[PDB]
Every structure is written in C-alpha cells, then in structure tokens.
Amino acid sequence: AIGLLVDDAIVVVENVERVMAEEGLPPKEATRKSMGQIQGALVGIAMVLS
C-alpha cells in the first residue's frame, strides 16, 4: 500500500506547484483550479483499482 498512497499524495501537491510557475500564482484559487484538472482522474482511478 505505502507505494500506491504517496502516489496519490505527490500528484495533487506538485500539480499545484506547476500552476505556481507555469502561471506564477501561489494562492487558494491555484489549488482550486489545479484539481479541476485532476478531480476527474482521482475518483475514476479509485474505481478501477477498486
């Protein structure tokens, strides 16, 4: 498990980090519109691993 666990953590974290450079922008709304791109995955990948 430990593997497929930080795999899910790492992604959401560093996907903000691209938004705050690729379009330099720290705040809440970067976090928000970054897992607008990811939220779709996340649940769908959880239902195939399931």
Binding site: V43, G44, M47, V48
Partner: protein
C-alpha cells in the same frame, strides 16, 4: 486394479490458485477496469489505451 477397489482424494485440494481461481479473478478484474473508464470518460478508445 482388481474388483472392489476404488479411490478418493484425502484430504490436496479443493480448488487451487493458479488453477480455476487466478483466471476467473483477472478475467472479472478486466470486465470492471474497462468500466469506470467509461463512467468518467465515454468513447471506445480511452480504455483500450
């Protein structure tokens, strides 16, 4: 062998793990997987990827 001598398996296995199990498991595990790649996607190309 002579008459009045049959056999029966004590006692190995009932159904094993490379045998009729593993298949059936993966088999089903595919019929899903392809789904939920459709419940969030719609196509007939996304899942075959």
């Amino acid at each position: 062998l002579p008459t009045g001598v049959g056999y029966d398996w004590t006692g190995s296995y009932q159904e094993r793990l490379s045998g009729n199990q593993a298949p059936s498991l993966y088999a089903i595990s595919l019929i899903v997987v392809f789904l939920c790649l459709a419940a969030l996607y719609e196509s007939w190309s996304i899942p075959f990827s």
